[PDB]
Design an enzyme around this catalytic site. Structure first.
Site, short mmCIF file in Angstrom:
data_model
loop_
_atom_site.label_atom_id
_atom_site.label_comp_id
_atom_site.label_asym_id
_atom_site.label_seq_id
_atom_site.Cartn_x
_atom_site.Cartn_y
_atom_site.Cartn_z
N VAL C 18 6.26 18.88 -23.80
CA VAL C 18 5.54 17.71 -23.36
C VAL C 18 4.16 17.92 -23.09
CG1 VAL C 18 5.27 15.96 -21.25
CG2 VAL C 18 7.51 16.39 -22.22
N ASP C 123 21.70 13.56 -16.72
CA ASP C 123 20.77 14.64 -16.57
C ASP C 123 19.91 14.41 -15.42
OD1 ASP C 123 19.89 17.30 -16.85
OD2 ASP C 123 18.48 16.53 -18.50
#
Ligand SMILES: Nc1ncnc2c1ncn2[C@@H]1O[C@H](COP(=O)(O)OP(=O)(O)CP(=O)(O)O)[C@@H](O)[C@H]1O
Ligand SMILES: Nc1ncnc2c1ncn2[C@@H]1O[C@H](COP(=O)(O)OP(=O)(O)CP(=O)(O)O)[C@@H](O)[C@H]1O
Ligand SMILES: C[C@H](O)CONC(=O)c1oc2c(F)cncc2c1Nc1ccc(I)cc1F
Ligand SMILES: C[C@H](O)CONC(=O)c1oc2c(F)cncc2c1Nc1ccc(I)cc1F
Ligand SMILES: [Mg+2]
Ligand SMILES: [Mg+2]
Lengths: 270, 286, 260, 285
Positions: C18, C123
């Site tokens: 990211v 998650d």
């Protein structure tokens, strides 16, 4: 799809169509068409407003969450804690530092840049429709007059002029074209916002005649008195304000240029 | 007076920035009209508005709508006033199509006396004379409302939404002049609207006058300022009436008749002396 | 459509897949730096976006758009501040109990939202809960998320429900599995520790939590945690899937409790 | 910074390995990045603890250059092995000749003994990917549990896809170097047959020559240990592997006993072209 099945929303208090504080997966804002028989004109209004919001996902656009039809026509958006820019500036007269004022300008520009980039003209930008969320983040709201630019000039047709006069561009007031709105008209409104930000007051405070202001602004006689900017206002801002406020719409900068002007300014102080 | 004190009966109407409710003031049992005007304003000026409205407690005239009290709650100044079950001449003009010159005579007297009352006993001009602001009732009373008594409220109302038409005098539109002379013009224009039964700006075309997309407000204002005043049709009205509205509608306020001059006008002498079942005409048209 | 045309997004400082970008202001771009999109990598991307497009809630990371043409990429708001993991476990920020409950509450608010839209996050953990501006919870990372109707098991063991670990049920993921994850988050919040600290073998934790033998040690909760919160942690951590509350009830309990 | 990347040697669970050169030196090494978000006192503790690797000197242990922290990850700079792991080698050879497994077995036993006697540490992580080899023919153990704090910090991890964990470690009972013998044994079967030996092959699947990790953990704990087939492997080899794979650590072979096993005595006598076999299997030939 963003239709909220009936029953889920829990309308509460009122604030100011009409707007309530409600409940739907947390605090939300609910904007309703109070009445019972929606005219096909109020209907297309709703369809259009939803249509515009659907295309927005940006931290400076107030977050559209979904709409309801069955109980009444309604638009659901994020709830905001904290006040409008109008409220800070003219009600509780918040003593923002100039770096903050510049930043509010900056963010407001950021949200507008994002809308224009997707061809949305807001048409009702003003202090009240700019919320300082958690006192830290500008969220532009109220898309009740928002519209998307049509590629074809004959789709326009006839719309009765509405809006707050202090933020209306002279060409909009005059209402001589089929469509006098433009990205540039939004800029002018933002120009008046710069005015409130750099001066602390609304324009034309000596004049209380509503029709006179409409007439004198549309005619070119009347325009904001830029001398009333507070002394700590960076010269670049005063210039930028005067530019957004130009009477000849094409002489006004658009939002990328406005954004650049503010970045370049920011770059100038330690 | 406070917000809990009230129970809603019905919605009497709404405008550009205000809403009016027929209500029942619970403590007293009184039925009154409650006007709410939305304003986002500092406590110091809201309190100044209330305090300035308290002057209406003394405003006692049969040409002036009565005042019960005023307050601020939530986001809205409330003015509580004499309920007028006949409504505004705006509402009436819708049902009546055109108002007979003879009734308009009574109205013209009522307006003048009321403007005189306001002027002399309370130092103020109306500011906003037009059919929707002349209210009439079962007992045949014609009263004025929505006049500019609180100076602060005037100021706070300037940040406003755009109207769709206007009754503002040309000299005010040009910031050239400001006096009762301007309220006279508005009465003049009102009368023409009430007589012909259609808002007189712009004037009706040759065909349209035989029967008997809207012009944007900027164009209306530009008209008022730059064009000759409207006027009554030739035959349908007495020469005295035609002359009366004419002296009310002269562009130059100086040359425009004043309240003293209007009061002794042919049209007023006549109408005063006439006896008309106004109260009767009213209930019969509703 | 939310496709951002090639040319506009400009990538910057990596954080690790990211980066920080510029597209109408600060954003966050999550890229897939391989120019060989596996037909399964393209499928992955397709679903993550398809999930994200359904979200418009103040406690879910704001999805802004996607790009395919320099590379596969997902654009979302850029959040200033730190994740709940970083706060609890790294800088050991000393939140007051009201702030802990508030973090729990908002987290629940977002989970509630996801569930009502039939999204199973799959998650959810500390790392994926960002405290935006240190005050608003933004539930992020939707790379495993699915819409509830073979998959090799994937995730972080400490937040997995024993039925998830076991992988023996026909539908090992469920709204209730997310609730378990949530319970672990509750745990971290109310102890300031991770579970199973006295055990440092990954395969042992996997096996023993799956078998049903091992379970978070509730003695570690701070002395100032309300009896009611401690109870809620219990119900959320329940070994038997169907004995766990759903997010409507969790939200209710926390909002109720918060008033004391 | 001062390391130039030459290639990627590969990656597994929470870590990546690059072959690098120290820019001014020209010293080639293997740099492992382990991804960790930990308190700063805890990264310092790990780095300090890794320093005991400087005290490790054995031709059966991979050499260590240094360790440090940077950008949310621990770097372990270590001896480059140009043959990579037996995991990597296994892929290209299919199966690994028994005779070669003899040398691996010795190395692993010798290595585990050195770690035990000289440093009082067990490996904790024996599997083919942590047995590295090179073109000089040495065979070395890597990735062993030297830092107790690194062990702790690696618990917060992602699920794996398989396991070489001894049953006693799985069930949390007492364990020691006996656990490591189990893993060596399990790895020996993998490398000989060319298939991760859990679960044991089907009738069909066998003649030619997935499963959830929880199933595998459960197999390890509740099923019988794998074994080589007969006939195609030496009896001594089969005996050796079986003594490694006994579920009771207390009835399982120990380091002293394996060192003198028949399969070991034999291979130690054998002279094998190991380095030649390797280069043959991969990339110097
Ligand atoms: N005292 C009273 N009794 C009965 N009805 C009243 C009243 N005061 C006002 N109304 C009704 O309420 C309506 C709304 O009044 P308001 O003053 O808000 O708008 P308006 O019609 O005068 C046009 P604008 O807001 O542009 O000046 C009027 O048309 C009038 O008929
Ligand atoms: N010093 C060294 N020299 C050459 N190659 C090395 C090396 N250290 C590690 N490698 C290679 O890097 C690969 C990745 O190392 P790492 O130990 O992270 O993964 P792994 O294969 O052991 C999987 P896991 O993390 O699940 O135990 C290994 O397969 C090994 O071949
Ligand atoms: C657009 C507004 O919403 C409606 O029009 N204006 C008013 O109603 C109004 O404008 C005012 C002003 F400028 C000063 N003081 C009082 C008033 C007043 N209201 C009012 C006045 C007299 C009486 I008797 C009753 C009233 F409601
Ligand atoms: C996260 C990785 O993908 C998996 O590999 N694990 C390790 O590499 C590893 O786990 C450890 C531990 F728990 C304690 N001390 C050291 C280590 C160590 N690395 C290591 C050890 C010795 C040598 I020589 C070189 C190394 F890299
Ligand atoms: Mg009125
Ligand atoms: Mg390894």
């Amino acid at each position: 799809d963003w239709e909220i099945p009936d029953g889920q929303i829990t309308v509460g208090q009122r604030i100011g169509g009409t707007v309530y504080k409600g409940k739907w997966h947390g605090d939300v804002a609910v904007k309703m068409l109070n009445v019972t028989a929606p005219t096909p004109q109020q209907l297309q209004a709703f369809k259009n407003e939803v249509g515009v919001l659907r295309k927005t996902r940006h931290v400076n656009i107030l977050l559209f969450m979904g709409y309801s039809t069955k109980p009444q026509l309604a638009i659901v958006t994020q709830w905001c804690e904290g006040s409008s820019l109008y409220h800070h500036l003219h009600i509780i007269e918040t003593k923002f530092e100039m770096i903050k004022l510049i930043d509010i300008a900056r963010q407001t520009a950021q949200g507008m840049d994002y809308l224009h980039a997707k061809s949305i003209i807001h048409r009702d930008l003003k202090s009240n429709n700019i919320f300082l969320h958690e006192d830290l983040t500008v969220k532009i709201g109220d898309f009740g007059l928002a519209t998307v630019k049509s590629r074809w000039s004959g789709s326009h047709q006839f719309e009765q002029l509405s809006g707050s006069i202090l933020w209306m561009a002279p060409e909009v007031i005059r209402m001589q074209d089929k469509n006098p709105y433009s990205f540039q008209s939004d800029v002018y409104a933002f120009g008046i916002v710069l005015y409130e930000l750099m001066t602390g007051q609304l324009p034309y405070s000596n004049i209380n005649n509503r029709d006179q202001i409409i007439f004198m602004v549309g005619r070119g006689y009347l325009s904001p008195d830029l001398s009333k900017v507070r002394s700590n206002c960076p010269k670049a801002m005063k210039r930028l304000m005067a530019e957004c406020l130009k009477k000849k719409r094409d002489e006004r900068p658009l939002f990328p240029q406005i954004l650049a002007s503010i970045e370049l300014l920011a770059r100038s102080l330690p | 007076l406070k917000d809990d004190d009230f129970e809603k009966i019905s919605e009497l109407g709404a405008g550009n920035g205000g809403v009016v409710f027929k209500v029942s003031h619970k403590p007293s049992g009184l039925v009154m009209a409650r006007k709410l005007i939305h304003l986002e304003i500092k406590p110091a000026i809201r309190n100044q508005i209330i305090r300035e409205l308290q002057v209406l407690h003394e405003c006692n005239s049969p040409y002036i709508v009565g005042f019960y009290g005023a307050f601020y709650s939530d986001g809205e100044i409330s003015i509580c006033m004499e309920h007028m079950d006949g409504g505004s001449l705006d509402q009436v003009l819708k049902k009546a199509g055109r108002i007979p010159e003879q009734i308009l005579g009574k109205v013209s007297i009522a307006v003048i006396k009321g403007l005189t009352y306001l002027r002399e006993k309370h130092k103020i001009m109306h500011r906003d004379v037009k059919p929707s602001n002349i209210l009439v009732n079962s007992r045949g009373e014609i009263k004025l409302c929505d006049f500019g008594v609180s100076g602060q409220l005037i100021d706070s109302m300037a940040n406003s939404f755009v109207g769709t038409r206007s009754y503002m005098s040309p000299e005010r539109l040009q910031g050239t002049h400001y006096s009762v002379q301007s309220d006279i013009w508005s009465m003049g224009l009102s009368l023409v609207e009430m007589a012909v039964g259609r808002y007189p700006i712009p004037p009706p075309d040759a065909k349209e006058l035989e029967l008997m997309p809207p012009m944007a407000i900027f164009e209306l204002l530009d008209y008022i300022v730059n064009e000759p005043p409207p006027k009554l049709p030739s035959g349908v009205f007495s020469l005295e009436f035609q002359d009366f509205v004419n002296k009310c509608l002269i562009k130059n306020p100086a040359e425009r008749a004043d309240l003293k001059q209007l009061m002794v006008h042919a049209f007023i002498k006549r109408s005063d002396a006439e006896e008309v079942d106004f109260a009767g005409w009213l209930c019969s048209t509703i």
